[PDB]
Design a protein around this ligand. Structure first.
Ligand SMILES: CCCCCCCCCCC(CCCCCCCCCC)(CO[C@H]1O[C@@H](CO)[C@H](O[C@@H]2O[C@@H](CO)[C@H](O)[C@@H](O)[C@@H]2O)[C@@H](O)[C@@H]1O)CO[C@H]1O[C@@H](CO)[C@H](O[C@@H]2O[C@@H](CO)[C@H](O)[C@@H](O)[C@@H]2O)[C@@H](O)[C@H]1O
Lengths: 48, 367, 75, 738, 86, 649
């Protein structure tokens, strides 16, 4: 999550917009699933 | 049931945090001035009878299931002149301490997490006229409910909000059978930038911007018996999310969600009035109301009755509330209970709220 | 005495000779996620998707009838 | 409205507040840098207040609030308003109230939160209540003190993965050795057992029996000789038994029985080389050809030895009972030693007689060679399950765990076997168009024979002496049919619902228990071969066989008094019924309310065996639906000795959602009824008593007549209604797919 | 105008644990378990009145890793606890 | 912080076996639902990106059935020991990123039924039928390609409050897919669940059904696939069968189909359980070898030419085989069957909201009469009479806990202070207790068949002997008698000197209990218990001292007699042979304490348990005509003798 929340040096906004690097939110994958406010709203994908 | 509820961040801010207001159907915008008058209407701190006060409030959650899950509140006020008052409050919701144990011997050093959410606010209330008062409040909100794991970052999310409130309290007016007193109040609450739970501007949630408007009347008989009747109206100042569709099939839903979520909080406040297919009659469906009655004996015993109605299409929180209050010398004790009238399980059912306030300092005469 | 451990989203109940009779696991919304009347001092596998919820309440009924409550973090 | 204007409600106790910061830093490098440390605010409240007092001599307050009180019912709040005796209103109560009823058919409720109002109109008194009920009604049945616990176990529900025969020899000796139980026709005495399991704990301590970690190789066929009635392929997995065995056929299990003898590893004609002692070269340690890594043997590197508190064993019948079942891929391996008279047999390798764990050659780490050597053990459970291998048959499937039974004793344990197709019948009938085998032996009768006799569980009387057709009761033998310490029941055959009933139903030699195509159509419906030849889940597919039911009860007394399964029971909620009559709370019994103990005081009832029913309210409940309790009670008084009543009660449960699943139903029941009470004094009875030979009494004689009628009108709440009809969901399929 | 005694209580603890497995025939001393915890608990009382008592507390705990399966852990709890008697 | 080890399951051991199942997935640009294990595709149209732009995205759901491996490596034949999972990628020629938004092993409560259901084929593990069971979610399958998942009409998502947030709960259906070669004409595939359900308090059984064709497969036509419920005590011998031909949802156009067309009311099961009762009563008259039965032995009333009205349901085909019981359903099966004769059909069927409806909420009544009298501190009588009908109960009792039986019960208890009939000078405590009572219980349901009401079964029998048998075997009768003389003793005079030989040192207790019963399981039951106890105790009040300090002694005659004659439920002609348990015992223990020296002390105690075996023959056979009072003052042979000596110096 450091790549998305506090961009380390050398990482740009383009590096985080690729469909291979971008943050996935649960609303995109599960638009009909309700998450309580303040709970985990991101899908932590396993990337190969 | 609940169709298209308003989604806001930190919804714990809208929970009644004191037994007195809870016993009156979760309303305080136009009741008599009290130590808890910061969540409801900070403007009536200028009408306090005592110079300063401190309150402790306890609202337990899931009492049958677990202990130490509760919403706690500490309030302090100090009216310095006959026209002005300072107040600071601290609402705290927490799950209690949870030990993160993965067996691995029964003497391992275990991390303890305390998922919690709190809002710290300070207000200044000033009496403009002899019957009217105003207040401004600044609030810091912090949400820290998630637990750190691998690939889950439990960094706290914060936001700031301001509140503008006004309180009207007339002088005693004699009638044919009683000498009553009128009250009115408004409170625009939680006006601030969106809270980013995941620390990303693309994924941010509206603060629960709220408008409370209410009025009250006090039936005063025999100069030591009071019957206080109060009404409150509340509207969220957040745009309603799109429903079935208002431009393929899911493309319309995604586009509607996109246009809803790209709305500023300032513009969202004005877009709350409307943004729905229905007219004014169906716009009233977004309004919650509460009616309350409070009987006062010697100003040291109170009996509180209240009804709260949220339109079942949104939220569906409908209940009756009972409350009692006792004042010994300088210490007031308040308890309240809720009887739900809705299909959805209220989390505060079968729960006794407890409030404790200390009043000290000088005493101010009421106009 | 009684301690609950969660390793890989697997919940394990460890009691020092206190024999348990029933386990109920509740979500913070008060929802029953898992009920087992055949506890065996063993590891329960609760469905791993809980819609972003992390905190669970474990309610353990012993044979004598006492109830032990533990709040855990589902990780 | 109140008698005076004085207010003396005074708080008592303390309030504690915590204002602080919590800081935590755990150096897990896998965590994100954003999770390096946690700085949270700490706020805690510790209210322990109490409120007692009066408001104007008419209002009474008794409140208590404790944030640290376990269970929320202990936070009491009671507001009692008692006006003058001349008023219509006699009492208004708000908060923790009770609605006690002097009725047997219509019970009141003690743990209520709401408003209770009492009115009086001359001679008619009306008590109304509207509240939420915080308690649940619980009933226990007691006979001779202790509570009765009924159990129901179908044949498929045996205690799996826990009980193991130590060898094929003991498994094939079991049935014949118990033919004349309690006499055991075997001289075997297991003197020493060492049990090894896969080490997943991986924790080194000096106190739990020490640190005895060893590399292990577990051989499936170790110590097995042939068996008279069983071909070699259900005794040993080895591909070819040519040259394998070297002792006579029916020899007792022993290392020297075959060519896997650890004592002869690599001598002249052994099937094992010295490579067998090494984990790395374990496969090459076999001289025979077709050897597989999970069939013929299994290996463990840091196998942990079980302490004596983790298992028990039957020294005569040669099986072991583990404390913790191995329901997973765990490996179980044993070495044991036993005596048959003056003869000693050993089947595995003990730590005392096995090869040393480590042999080191060389003098420093540059030239040193480490040889780590494995103990050779007998495999009781393999890494990978294969129900076709003989090791599968070592797991006992004739042991049933009585649920929550801990210290069962005779006279406090009943057990019966029934065939439920669908009703419970305690005998077996032949398939229509067929009959049971003709002229059976008395120990082989099936027709019109109680199932306890059919399954060889009742041949003894109460004193465990043989009785011709049994005494009708389960034979309770602490070393044979019951495990007293753990509350287990063990059948006298290894496959009671398989081979035993197959043999009792056999009509000719053409029928073979291992070939289901030869069954005689009575065996086709009654023989549950699959519960023994398949896993329990696999046996689920043979749905028509799981009809034999183990039913009974056991009494858990422990100490003095009836344990009513609840603590801090509300006062006045305990009802004790002996034989259809309600007992008196001060004469027939006494209640210790804190510990939940009911003590019977009537001497005749204690020595009676009459079942005693105990009803009570318990508020130690959680996850329950909100229950609304409302109603009124009318108590008109016709005369000083004649009172009639008018109770009406309603209880509504509020479902959590609109879908009520089966078992978690909601009720909307209504009950109403009428009661009459006529209590007179009869001096005629006193005069008649004074007419008796030596009686000169003067106490009065009373006559009391009580009648009641009740009507129950049940329903379900409208909230759990689908399309206007009361609905229970057998499966909405939301609970599938974990 | 307000006078009270301040009661200081400080408790320090340092515990070291070590499980070793030793081979007799070659140098193979295996570290199997361990613990290196130190904890400090400070408290400070002040009776503002007969009913009101203020206590300052400071708890600091550090656990060091002895074997790599355990992570170093720092736990610090500090604040004021106000207590009122009725 | 962990070292790298070649041991992944952390059992200290490195396995070298390579026996595993292979599954494979193609990764190629234009994959579609229905092939390559793809079950759903969710297209994302405009994703807001952190750089301010937008992108398309496509999420593909795969479901690889574990039971259908593409290949097997090594020697693995079942799924009982699956210890490792491996994923590997191959075939790609350049850098490839695959992101898993989810990756799960999914386990279901519903198990695929292996084994045959129709006797015509009898070879299930063949014919290349692909049979998959999964679930379809509103949360995961709202964009499913053949038909989007929607709730059945009237069904709503459950709503809960998580923490001041409204959470819509998931709504799910069971999905069954038939593929590969397809279903033969009379073949079926089904899933099953072991349950415990009592349906006797409800009038209707309901379930929603849906049918669709598989993509890239020949279209499924109406009334070719038959959905069925089979429930009872098993799936082969004792079950009800409820079948319905399925109308297929028309596919080919848009993916979004209205819920009324996804879940057609024509495909809904709405079964009155009274029809099941009628079918069972009718099938009572059908022989098991009759030609009116199917090849599987199922009796279908709709196929019975001599029966008018069929099964009473025009939409459902009802069948029954072997006396199932919906008062206790142990086995529940849903599945699909074929009716296309010269075809192999493929398709997908959804099952949803299997439920009981129409609660039978007629109540009941109870009446209680109590008479309590006392006769001048000499006699007390308490009489109780209770009567309750079917349907009565407590306020808290639910549908299956209320009384399913009529109860008639009385109880009389008398207490006599017979010691007051003698002069008070020499005071004797002689309390006499007499208790009698019986209860008669008539069940609502006949114990046989368990789900037909007793009255209806009696009406539909038309045979006097069978009617009488049915009526009498159902009665549950208990009679209790208790006679007690507990605590008989003589009190000391107001000023009397204790003596060792005094009768005041004795206590006597006599208890007698008798229970007679007959019910559905036992045709004749008698329990007799007699307890006679005599207690003695005397404390003496003031080479070495030989006068004992105290003497204790008590004797106990304990006789328990049980007679059990289990009933033959079919006919009341013979009955099983009665079984006798007899527990005639004679117990006595004595003790005395000495005080030989001011320092020395001796306590001695002995206990003896004797068993009386006068009721047995020379062989180990009980005597039927042996009374419990036969030889009451008989000391038997010793069974257990214990002694204890305590010496303090
Ligand atoms: C953001 C948090 C703010 C917190 C403010 C705390 C204020 C504490 C003051 C104690 C107090 C209030 C009761 C509070 C109890 C609630 C505690 C609940 C804890 C829940 C866990 C108790 O006074 C009452 O309580 C009794 C206690 O027994 C007293 O008895 C006696 O008590 C002792 C003689 O006081 C005897 O020694 C003891 O022998 C007796 O017994 C009585 O005198 C009296 O009834 C009296 O208040 C008074 O004290 C002065 C001192 O300077 C305060 O001056 C102000 O302080 C700042 C204002 O803070 C202002 O800025 C500042 O301008 C201004 O100078 C004022 O406050 C004033 O009015």
């Amino acid at each position: 999550p450091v790549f998305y929340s506090s961009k380390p040096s050398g990482i740009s906004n383009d590096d985080l917009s690729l469909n291979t690097t971008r943050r996935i939110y649960s609303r995109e994958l599960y638009p009909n699933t309700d998450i309580a406010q303040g709970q985990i709203q991101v899908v932590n994908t396993l990337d190969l | 049931d609940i169709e298209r509820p308003i989604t806001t961040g930190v919804p714990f801010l809208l929970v009644a945090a004191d037994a007195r207001a809870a016993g009156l159907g979760d309303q305080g915008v136009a009741t008599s001035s009290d130590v808890f008058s910061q969540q409801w209407n900070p403007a009536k701190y200028a009408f306090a009878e005592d110079a300063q006060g401190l309150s402790i409030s306890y609202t337990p959650y899931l009492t049958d299931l677990a202990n130490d899950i509760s919403l706690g509140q500490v309030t302090y006020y100090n009216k310095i002149n006959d026209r002005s008052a300072f107040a600071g409050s601290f609402r705290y919701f927490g799950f209690g301490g949870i030990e993160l144990r993965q067996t691995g011997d029964p003497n391992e050093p275990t991390r303890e997490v305390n998922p919690n959410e709190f809002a710290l606010d300070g207000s200044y209330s000033l009496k403009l006229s002899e019957t009217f008062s105003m207040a401004v409040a600044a609030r810091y909100i912090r949400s820290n409910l998630k637990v750190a794991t691998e690939e889950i970052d439990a960094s706290a999310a914060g936001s700031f909000a301001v509140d503008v409130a006004g309180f009207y309290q007339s002088e005693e007016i004699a009638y044919s059978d009683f000498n009553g007193r009128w009250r009115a109040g408004f409170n625009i609450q939680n006006l601030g930038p969106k809270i980013s739970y995941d620390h990303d501007d693309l994924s941010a949630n509206f603060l629960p911007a709220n408008l409370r408007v209410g009025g009250g009347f006090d039936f005063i008989f025999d100069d030591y018996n009071k019957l206080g009747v109060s009404l409150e109206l509340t509207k969220l100042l957040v745009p309603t999310p799109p429903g079935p569709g208002t431009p393929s099939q899911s493309q319309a839903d995604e586009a509607n969600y996109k246009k809803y979520k790209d709305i500023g909080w300032v513009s969202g406040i004005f877009k709350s009035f409307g943004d729905a297919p229905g007219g004014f009659s169906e716009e009233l469906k977004e309004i919650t109301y509460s009616a309350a009655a409070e009987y006062m004996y010697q100003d040291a015993f109170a009996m509180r009755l209240g009804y709260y109605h949220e339109s079942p299409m949104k939220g569906a929180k409908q209940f009756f509330s009972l409350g009692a209050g006792f004042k010994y010398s300088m210490i007031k004790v308040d308890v309240s209970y809720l009887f739900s009238a809705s299909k959805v399980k209220n989390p505060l059912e079968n729960t006794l709220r407890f409030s404790l306030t200390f009043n000290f300092g000088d005493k101010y005469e009421t106009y | 005495s009684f301690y609950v451990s969660v390793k890989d989203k697997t919940i394990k109940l460890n009691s020092t000779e206190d024999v348990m009779r029933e386990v109920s696991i509740f979500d913070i919304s008060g929802k029953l996620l898992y009920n087992n009347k055949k506890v065996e001092n063993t590891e329960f596998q609760v469905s791993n998707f809980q819609s972003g919820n992390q905190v669970l309440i474990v309610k353990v009924t012993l044979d004598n009838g006492n109830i032990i409550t533990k709040k855990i973090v589902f990780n | 409205i109140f008698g005076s204007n004085t207010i003396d409600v005074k708080p008592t106790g303390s309030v504690e507040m915590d204002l602080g910061v919590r800081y935590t830093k755990q150096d897990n490098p896998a965590f994100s840098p954003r999770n390096r440390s946690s700085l949270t605010f700490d706020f805690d409240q510790r209210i322990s207040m109490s409120l007692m007092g009066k408001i104007g001599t008419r209002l009474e307050v008794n409140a208590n609030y404790d944030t640290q009180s376990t269970f929320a019912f202990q936070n009491l709040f009671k507001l009692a308003y008692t006006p003058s005796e001349d008023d219509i209103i006699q009492k208004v109560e708000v908060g923790n109230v009770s609605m006690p009823l002097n009725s047997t058919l219509i019970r009141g409720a003690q743990s209520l939160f709401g408003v209770k109002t009492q009115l009086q109109f001359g001679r008619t008194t009306i008590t109304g209540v509207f509240s939420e009920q915080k308690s649940q009604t619980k009933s226990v049945v007691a006979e001779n003190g202790g509570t009765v616990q009924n159990f129901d176990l179908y044949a498929l529900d045996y205690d799996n993965d826990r009980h193991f025969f130590l060898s094929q020899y003991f498994r094939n000796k079991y049935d014949v050795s118990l033919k004349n139980y309690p006499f055991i026709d075997s001289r075997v005495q297991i003197t020493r057992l060492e049990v090894w399991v896969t080490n997943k704990q991986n924790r080194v301590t000096t106190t739990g029996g020490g640190n005895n970690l060893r590399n292990i190789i577990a051989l499936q066929d170790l110590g097995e000789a042939q068996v008279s009635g069983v071909p070699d392929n259900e005794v040993v997995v080895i591909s070819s038994t040519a040259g394998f065995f070297n002792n006579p056929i029916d020899s007792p299990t022993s290392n020297t029985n075959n060519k896997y003898d650890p004592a002869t590893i690599g001598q002249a004609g052994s099937f094992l080389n010295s490579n067998i002692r090494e984990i790395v070269t374990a496969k090459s340690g076999f001289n025979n050809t077709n050897v597989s890594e999970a069939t013929d043997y299994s290996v463990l590197e840091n196998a942990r030895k079980l302490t004596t508190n983790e298992y028990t064993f039957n020294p005569q019948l040669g099986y072991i009972s583990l404390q913790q079942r191995l329901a997973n891929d765990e490996i179980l391996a044993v070495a044991f030693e036993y005596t048959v008279g003056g003869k000693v047999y050993q089947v595995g390798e003990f730590g005392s007689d096995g090869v040393d764990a480590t042999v080191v050659t060389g003098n420093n780490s540059s030239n040193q060679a480490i040889i780590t050597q494995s103990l050779v053990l007998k495999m009781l459970k393999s890494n990978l399950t294969n129900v076709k291998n003989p090791v599968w048959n070592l797991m006992m499937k004739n042991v049933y765990q009585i649920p929550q039974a801990y210290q069962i004793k005779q006279d406090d344990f009943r057990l019966n076997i029934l065939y439920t197709d669908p009703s419970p019948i305690n005998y077996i009938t032949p398939v229509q168009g067929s009959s049971f085998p003709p002229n059976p032996a008395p120990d082989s009768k099936v027709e019109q024979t109680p199932l306890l006799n059919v399954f060889n569980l009742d041949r003894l009387n109460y004193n465990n002496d043989p009785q011709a057709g049994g005494d009708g009761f389960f034979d309770y033998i602490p070393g044979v049919t019951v495990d007293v310490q753990n509350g287990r029941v063990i059948f006298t055959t290894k496959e009671p619902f398989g081979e035993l009933i197959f043999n009792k139903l056999q009509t000719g030699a053409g029928e073979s228990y291992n070939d289901p195509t030869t069954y005689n159509a009575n065996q086709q419906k009654y023989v549950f071969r699959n519960m023994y030849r398949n896993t329990q889940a696999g046996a689920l597919q043979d749905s028509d066989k799981n009809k034999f039911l183990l039913r009974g009860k056991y009494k858990s007394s422990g100490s003095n008094g009836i344990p009513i399964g609840a603590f801090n029971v509300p006062q006045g909620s305990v009802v004790v019924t002996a034989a259809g009559r309600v007992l008196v709370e001060g004469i027939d019994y006494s209640v210790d309310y804190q510990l939940g103990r009911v003590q019977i005081l009537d001497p005749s009832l204690q020595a009676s065996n009459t079942p005693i029913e105990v009803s009570l309210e318990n508020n130690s409940i959680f996850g329950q639906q909100t229950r609304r309790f409302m109603g009124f009670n009318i108590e008109h008084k016709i005369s000083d000795k004649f009172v009639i009543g008018g109770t009406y009660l309603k209880m509504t449960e509020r479902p959590f959602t609109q879908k009520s699943t089966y078992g978690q139903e909601s009720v909307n029941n209504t009950i109403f009824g009428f009661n009459g009470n006529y209590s007179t004094e009869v001096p005629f009875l006193t005069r008649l008593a004074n007419k008796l030979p030596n009686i000169d009494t003067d106490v009065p004689s009373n006559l009391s007549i009580r009648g009641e009628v009740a009507f129950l009108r049940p329903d379900a709440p409208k909230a759990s209604d689908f399309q206007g009809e009361a609905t229970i969901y057998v499966d909405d399929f939301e609970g599938s797919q974990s | 105008i307000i006078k009270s005694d301040i009661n200081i209580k400080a408790d320090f603890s340092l515990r070291n644990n070590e499980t070793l497995v030793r081979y007799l025939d070659y140098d193979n001393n295996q570290l199997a378990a361990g613990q290196n915890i130190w904890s400090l608990k400070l408290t400070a009382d002040y009776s503002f009145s007969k009913n009101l008592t203020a206590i300052f507390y400071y708890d600091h705990s550090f656990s060091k890793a002895v074997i790599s399966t355990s992570f170093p852990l720092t736990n610090i709890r500090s604040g004021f606890t106000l207590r009122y008697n009725f | 912080t962990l070292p790298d080890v070649e041991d992944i399951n952390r059992d200290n051991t490195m396995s070298t076996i390579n026996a595993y199942y292979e599954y494979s997935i193609d990764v190629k640009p234009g994959m579609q639902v229905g092939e390559n294990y793809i079950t759903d595709i969710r297209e994302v149209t405009n994703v807001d990106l952190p750089n301010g732009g937008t992108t398309n995205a496509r999420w593909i759901q795969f479901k690889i059935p574990v039971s259908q491996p593409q290949n097997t490596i090594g020697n693995i034949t079942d799924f009982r020991s699956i210890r490792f999972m491996r994923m590997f990628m191959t075939g790609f020629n350049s850098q490839m990123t695959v992101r898993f938004g989810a990756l799960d092993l999914v386990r279901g409560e519903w198990r695929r039924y292996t084994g045959t259901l129709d006797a015509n084929d009898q070879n299930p593990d063949d014919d290349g039928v692909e049979f998959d069971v999964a679930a379809v979610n509103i949360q995961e399958n709202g964009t499913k390609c053949p038909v989007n998942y929607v709730m059945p009409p009237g069904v709503q998502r459950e709503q809960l409050y998580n923490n001041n947030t409204v959470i819509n709960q998931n709504e799910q259906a069971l999905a069954v897919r038939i593929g590969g070669a397809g279903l033969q004409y009379q073949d079926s595939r089904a899933v099953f669940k072991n349950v415990s359900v009592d349906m006797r308090q409800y009038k209707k059984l309901k379930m929603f059904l849906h049918a669709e064709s598989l993509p890239n497969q020949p279209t499924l036509e109406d009334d070719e696939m038959v959905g069925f419920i089979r429930f009872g005590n098993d799936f082969t011998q004792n079950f009800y069968q409820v079948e319905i031909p399925l109308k297929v949802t028309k596919t080919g156009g848009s993916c979004s189909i209205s819920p009324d067309l996804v879940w057609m009311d024509d495909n809904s099961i709405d079964l009155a359980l009274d029809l099941l009762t009628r079918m069972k009563i009718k099938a009572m008259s059908i022989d098991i070898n009759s030609s009116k039965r199917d090849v599987n032995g199922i009796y279908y009333p709709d196929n019975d030419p001599d029966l008018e009205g069929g099964d009473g349901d025009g939409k459902l085909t009802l069948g029954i085989k072997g006396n199932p019981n919906f008062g206790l359903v142990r086995n529940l099966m849903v599945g699909v069957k074929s009716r296309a004769d010269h075809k192999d059909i493929k398709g997908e069927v959804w099952f949803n909201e299997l439920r009981l409806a129409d609660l039978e909420n007629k109540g009941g009544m109870a009446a209680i009469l109590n008479v309590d009298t006392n006769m001048a501190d000499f006699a007390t009588v308490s009489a109780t009479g209770r009567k309750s009908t079917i349907g009565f109960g407590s306020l808290e009792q639910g549908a299956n806990e209320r009384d399913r039986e009529d109860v008639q019960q009385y109880n009389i208890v008398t207490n006599l202070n017979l010691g007051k009939l003698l002069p008070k000078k020499w005071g004797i405590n002689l309390p006499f207790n007499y208790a009698i009572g019986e209860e008669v219980i008539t069940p609502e349901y006949d114990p046989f068949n368990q789900d037909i009401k007793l009255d209806q079964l009696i009406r539909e029998t038309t045979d006097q002997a069978e009617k009488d048998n049915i009526r009498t075997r159902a009665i549950d009768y208990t009679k209790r008698k208790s006679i007690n003389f507990i605590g008989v003793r003589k009190d000391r005079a107001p000023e009397q000197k204790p003596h060792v030989y005094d009768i005041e040192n004795f206590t006597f207790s006599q208890s007698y209990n008798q229970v007679e019963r007959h019910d559905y399981e036992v045709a004749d039951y008698e329990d007799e218990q007699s307890n006679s106890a005599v207690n003695y105790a005397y404390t003496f009040q003031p080479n070495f001292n030989y006068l004992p300090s105290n003497i204790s002694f008590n004797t106990n005659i304990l006789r328990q007699s049980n007679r059990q004659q289990f009933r033959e439920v079919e006919v009341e002609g013979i009955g099983l042979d009665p079984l006798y348990r007899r527990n005639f015992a004679f117990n006595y223990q004595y003790g005395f304490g000495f005080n030989l020296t001011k320092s020395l002390k001796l306590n001695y105690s002995a206990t003896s348990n004797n068993i009386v075996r006068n009721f047995l023959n020379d062989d180990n056979s009980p005597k039927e005509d042996f009374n419990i009072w036969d030889d009451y003052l008989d000391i038997g042979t010793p069974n257990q003798h214990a002694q204890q000596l305590v010496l303090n110096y």
